[PDB]
Design a protein around this ligand. Structure first.
Ligand SMILES: OC[C@H]1O[C@H](C/C=C\c2ccc(-c3ccccc3)cc2)[C@@H](O)[C@@H](O)[C@@H]1O
Ligand code: NI
Length: 158
């Protein structure tokens, strides 16, 4: 089991960490959502699907910087929604193919009223998403850690 991002770093077999940059709507109001869909960026595959089934969970979702102080959130994982920051590890998604398949994670972030001005800084860390992979074959239990960085400023009026 291994993961990569669209253009492009990878995390090899056995886990590790990578940094991911995301484009954000540059203006969001109180009551509107920022959607950060990571499923178009993080792709995973099973290296031996004929004998092994890989199980993948969102172990933990944590907020940082601007998002942590100026936004409230949920995360959508494989159809289901959860508070973001997360309060527990999710159910699992099966990976049973050598073909790259998206990691189906999306954040929905909404400004709290105390946000005004630049509520997320360009280049700043906004979130960490930990992917936990196990299988039905041996005791492999690995974390793939995605550090999420803002590409651009996000302003909340006025
Ligand atoms: O993505 C599937 C598996 O890929 C790798 C497997 C690591 C060692 C391994 C490799 C091949 C075989 C194997 C089994 C049957 C036939 C041929 C090879 C068994 C273990 C590891 O990432 C496992 O964690 C993961 O479950
Ligand atoms: Ni591979």
């Amino acid at each position: 089991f291994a993961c990569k991002t669209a253009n492009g770093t990878a995390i090899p077999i056995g886990g590790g960490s990578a940094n991911v940059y995301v484009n954000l709507a540059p203006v969001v109001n109180v009551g509107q959502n920022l959607v950060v869909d990571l499923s178009t960026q993080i792709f995973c595959h099973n290296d031996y699907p004929e004998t092994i089934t890989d199980y993948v969970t969102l172990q933990r979702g944590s907020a940082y910087g601007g998002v942590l102080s100026n936004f409230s959130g949920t995360v959508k994982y494989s159809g289901s929604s959860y508070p973001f920051p997360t309060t527990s590890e999710t159910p699992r998604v099966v990976y049973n193919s050598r073909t790259d398949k998206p990691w189906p994670v999306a954040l929905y972030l909404t400004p709290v009223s105390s946000a005004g001005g630049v509520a997320i800084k360009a280049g700043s860390l906004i979130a960490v998403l930990i992917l936990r992979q196990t299988n039905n074959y041996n005791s492999d239990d690995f974390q793939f850690v995605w550090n999420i960085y803002a590409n651009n400023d996000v302003v909340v009026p006025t």
